[PDB]
């Protein structure tokens, strides 16, 4: 199938093909959950990268790069895939004091898409030092290499995301914002990080409220109804008109339906990377009256021939509804470009270049020596090449300097569903090249979010709040 391509060296791939969109003795397989199109798109990106690598006679010549892609759920199943990657061809994993001479089934793994499963996989692989390049993982806890020696990345961490948010906030002169986080760890960490970063730059937070966990397509308890009503009522009562939402893309459906029902209009919603590029959420098309939506996500890079490639196409390794689900999203996915697809492309190309250097071949036959995972990890820190007119090299903390971008959701099926308005360069931590933004105001003026008109005695904890004298 498309989950397996034999070759000289394997390449594990963990992708979120399903999510919990609604008894411990039986284990529900990930095939029974609702299909996520984003995961299948990312897997197609990895497969396209591997096929393009195989085509080329310059990169890894004479060595077939194979891969064993397995389906990882968002949280549910993230142990069996690692156990299967680490095992031999006989599905047996020896236990020994030293793994220097041990050769595993896969030479590297393209890590999961969320921080928690990435942490679990890295904790399991730290013994074997199997290289693991995650995409779209933003937790700052993975930056340090004391406890994650074998973890790398291809996306800027949450530090750069928060910096981009604060730079955009300061550019348009908003110093009165509302922060919403989800009950999960990711939302809490991101909200705390944003609060700490923003408290020293003369921008105050009106309040922070936590959305209850509420997966869509389910009957939610009246207690959650009351909680959502209270949160939206507090949003409406407050004078702040810039709401920053830090939550996974699944738990926002009920919240946005509640906001739509309450007819709360006139806010500049700022998205995290979780849902800044969510196509199924953007398909609602009834959020145009909620104001303007922005979001932080990886800079678009047009990968040639990926759209045509996508269109032409053991356990927990097969999904059937994915094709028929992604067929309906072909046009929007094609027009939206490639943002995280480029992250997966870069991860695979970095692994290939590391293997190319480790084998030590140049435009001719390779030495075809045995490759231990730790050797590949050692040689992968030094990769440096130009991929699609971008620079790919790893920081001392295993990060790739890829430019972020603030996207403004514009609803036009004939054009790009995620128009890009600003570019952020992580290397200098400066946000620049801000372009025209189609605001929700009457005369296309910048929305004003300030708790005090400029005058001076202070009132309340927040420094930015006062009454003119």
């Amino acid at each position: 199938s498309d989950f397996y391509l034999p070759g000289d060296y394997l390449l594990g791939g963990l992708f979120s093909l399903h999510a919990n969109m609604k008894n411990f003795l039986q284990v529900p397989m990930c095939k029974e959950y609702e299909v996520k199109v984003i995961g299948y798109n990312l897997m197609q990106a990895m497969r396209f990268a591997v096929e393009e690598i195989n085509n080329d006679s310059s990169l890894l010549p004479g060595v077939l790069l194979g891969y064993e892609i397995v389906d990882v759920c968002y949280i549910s199943n993230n142990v069996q895939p690692v156990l299967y990657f680490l095992a031999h061809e006989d599905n047996l994993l020896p236990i020994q004091e030293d793994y220097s001479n041990y050769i595993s089934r896969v030479v590297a793994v393209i890590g999961p898409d969320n921080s928690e499963s990435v942490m679990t996989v890295a904790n399991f692989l730290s013994l074997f030092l199997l290289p693991q390049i995650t995409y779209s993982a933003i937790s700052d806890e993975l930056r340090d290499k004391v406890r994650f020696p074998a973890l790398l990345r291809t996306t800027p961490s949450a530090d750069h995301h928060i910096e981009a948010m604060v730079q955009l906030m300061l550019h348009f002169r908003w110093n009165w914002i509302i922060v919403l986080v989800s009950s999960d760890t990711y939302g809490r960490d991101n909200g705390q990080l944003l609060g700490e970063r923003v408290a020293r730059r003369d921008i105050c937070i009106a309040f922070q409220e936590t959305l209850p966990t509420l997966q869509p397509n389910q009957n939610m308890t009246s207690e959650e109804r009351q909680r959502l009503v209270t949160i939206v009522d507090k949003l409406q009562q407050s004078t702040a008109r810039v709401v920053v939402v830090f939550s996974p893309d699944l738990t926002l459906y009920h919240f946005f339906n509640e906001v739509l029902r309450q007819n709360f209009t006139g806010a500049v919603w700022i998205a995290s990377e979780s849902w800044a590029i969510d196509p199924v959420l953007h398909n609602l098309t009834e959020l145009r009256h909620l104001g303007t939506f922005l979001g932080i996500t990886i800079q678009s890079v047009p990968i040639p021939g990926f759209s045509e490639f996508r269109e032409w196409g053991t356990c927990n390794q097969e999904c059937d509804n994915c094709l028929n689900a992604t067929l309906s999203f072909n046009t929007i996915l094609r027009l939206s470009g490639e943002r995280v697809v480029y992250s997966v492309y870069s991860a695979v190309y970095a692994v290939a270049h590391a293997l190319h250097s480790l084998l030590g071949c140049d435009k001719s036959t390779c030495t075809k020596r045995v490759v231990y995972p730790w050797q590949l990890l050692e040689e992968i820190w030094k990769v440096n090449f130009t991929l699609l007119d971008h620079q790919i090299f790893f920081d001392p903390q295993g990060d790739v300097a890829l430019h972020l971008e603030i996207v403004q959701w514009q609803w036009d099926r004939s054009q790009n569903p995620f128009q890009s308005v600003a570019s952020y360069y992580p290397l200098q931590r400066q946000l620049k090249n801000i372009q025209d933004i189609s605001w929700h105001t009457i005369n296309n003026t910048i929305p004003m979010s300030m708790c005090s008109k400029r005058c001076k005695k202070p009132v309340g904890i927040h420094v930015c709040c006062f009454e003119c004298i």
Binding site: E97, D98, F124, R147, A199, F207, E209, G460
Partner: protein, 467 residues
């Protein structure tokens, strides 16, 4: 001393063990810890005593020998991952297969006595949940380990942080302080405590004036923010080091007295208790665990350490090479440790679950095939086991339930001592007629915000109104 040779004992149903016996890479090698820790050795001896006295018992596990494989795990999880993988390997072989699901495994260990550290407990629990291995832990208290979605086979013997946080929230609500400031350590412990307490407060009507984090040895800014609001109650859900650092800095700045609500981390610790000048910072109202203790454990430790030096015993009879060159004075300090009872009760609970699973009666045990580890989970939830004559029960979410004692620091001769002023057992009861407050007279400090009134919303979660 031939102590390490006793870390492994054969039997019909061996048990697992993950203890902090020792403390503190460009190659895939498991690091070795050489420094010796007394707490881990004492807990290992406690579990060994529990297993041996269970084997001594006749009406519990009759005709079956209970084994154990005590393993040294440092605080790091990298060293501790190898013992878990050795646990899940089939008996008689050193290889662990990667099957589709748990039903095809035949692990060599019936259960696991999980790690003391909570992060290590999370790692090991997430690993074992795939195989549905029943793992009971001592000392692991952080709350998200109770999520049965991702930890279907993790139990514990110490109450979770939710219990003490609910007790603190009930104390704040009953005394009438609905305008409080919450703090926590920058480590995972403080962040988790704060996340649970925000929800508990929002449910109970209270909510936070300022929710901050105190970094481990910034704090000046956190104290400034706390001082900005007119809040007389501060809940410091922090570890010992963060609490001590905050108190030292606030002493340096001569902070006004406040009512500090203390977690179990620093409520009884002598690092802050003995801090000079601490008496000028209000009454410390904390919740402390109300649990029994192994009365005969010090006698067992001393007699076992005396007997292990006899060469004849060692001849008759590594995981912890540092455990050999020790003396009784190197472990005498932690003899009266609370966690020894937690380990003893965890071992007793696993033994009782095994006795129930085989459906054994007093005379003996029916003969059948060995019971798989996942078969214990049915009889581990909703299980009542007697430990030292005191009944205990495992919740449907897998946490033991036990009472708490509300204590406050009573100052006398610069040597504070604890006193009983309340008892939490799911519904707090307090005796406020005997509480000595810190104000000018013996009057309860008032920290109240008006929820109704002209109004100007105030608070971190936008609850109150500055009428």
């Amino acid at each position: 001393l031939c102590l390490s040779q006793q870390l492994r004992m054969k039997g019909d149903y061996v048990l697992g063990g993950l203890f902090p016996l020792g403390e503190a890479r460009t190659r895939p090698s498991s690091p070795v810890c050489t420094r010796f820790s007394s707490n881990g050795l004492l807990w290992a001896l406690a579990m060994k005593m529990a297993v041996e006295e269970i084997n001594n018992k006749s009406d519990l596990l009759p005709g079956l020998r209970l084994g154990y494989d005590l393993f040294d795990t440092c605080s790091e999880p990298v060293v501790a991952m190898k013992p878990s993988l050795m646990f899940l390997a089939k008996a008689g072989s050193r290889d662990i297969a990667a099957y589709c699901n748990y039903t095809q495994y035949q692990p060599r260990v019936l259960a696991v006595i999980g790690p003391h550290s909570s992060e290590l407990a999370m790692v090991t629990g997430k690993f074992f949940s795939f195989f549905l291995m029943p793992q009971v832990s001592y000392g692991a208290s952080m709350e998200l380990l109770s999520a049965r979605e991702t930890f279907p086979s993790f139990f514990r013997t110490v109450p979770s942080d939710r219990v003490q946080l609910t007790a603190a929230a009930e104390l704040l609500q009953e005394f009438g302080w609905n305008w409080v400031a919450a703090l926590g350590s920058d480590d995972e412990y403080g962040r988790q405590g704060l996340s649970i307490f925000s929800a508990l407060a929002a449910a109970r009507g209270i909510c936070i004036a300022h929710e901050g984090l105190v970094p481990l040895p910034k704090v000046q800014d956190v104290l400034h923010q706390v001082n900005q609001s007119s809040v007389q109650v501060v809940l410091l859900f922090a570890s010992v080091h963060a609490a001590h650092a905050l108190f030292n800095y606030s002493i340096s700045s001569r902070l006004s007295p406040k009512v500090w609500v203390a977690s179990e981390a620093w409520l009884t610790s002598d690092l802050v208790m003995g801090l000079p000048g601490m008496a000028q910072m209000g009454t410390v109202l904390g919740f402390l665990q109300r649990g029994a203790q192994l009365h005969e454990f010090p006698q067992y430790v001393k007699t076992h350490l005396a007997l292990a030096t006899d060469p004849a015993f060692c001849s008759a009879l590594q995981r912890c090479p540092q455990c050999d060159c020790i003396t009784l004075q190197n472990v005498s300090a932690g003899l009266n440790h609370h966690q020894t009872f937690s380990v003893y009760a965890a071992v007793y609970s696993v033994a009782q679950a095994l006795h129930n699973t085989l459906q054994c009666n007093a005379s003996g045990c029916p003969a059948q095939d060995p019971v798989k580890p996942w078969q214990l989970l049915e009889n581990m939830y909703n299980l009542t086991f007697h430990v030292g004559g005191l009944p205990l029960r495992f919740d449907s979410s897998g946490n033991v339930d036990m009472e708490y004692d509300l204590k406050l620091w009573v100052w006398q001769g610069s040597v504070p001592r604890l006193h009983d002023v309340g008892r939490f057992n799911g519904s707090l009861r307090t005796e406020r007629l005997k509480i000595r407050w810190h104000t000018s007279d013996n009057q309860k400090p008032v920290s109240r915000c008006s929820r109704q009134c002209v109004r100007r919303v105030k608070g971190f979660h936008s609850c109150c109104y500055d009428c």
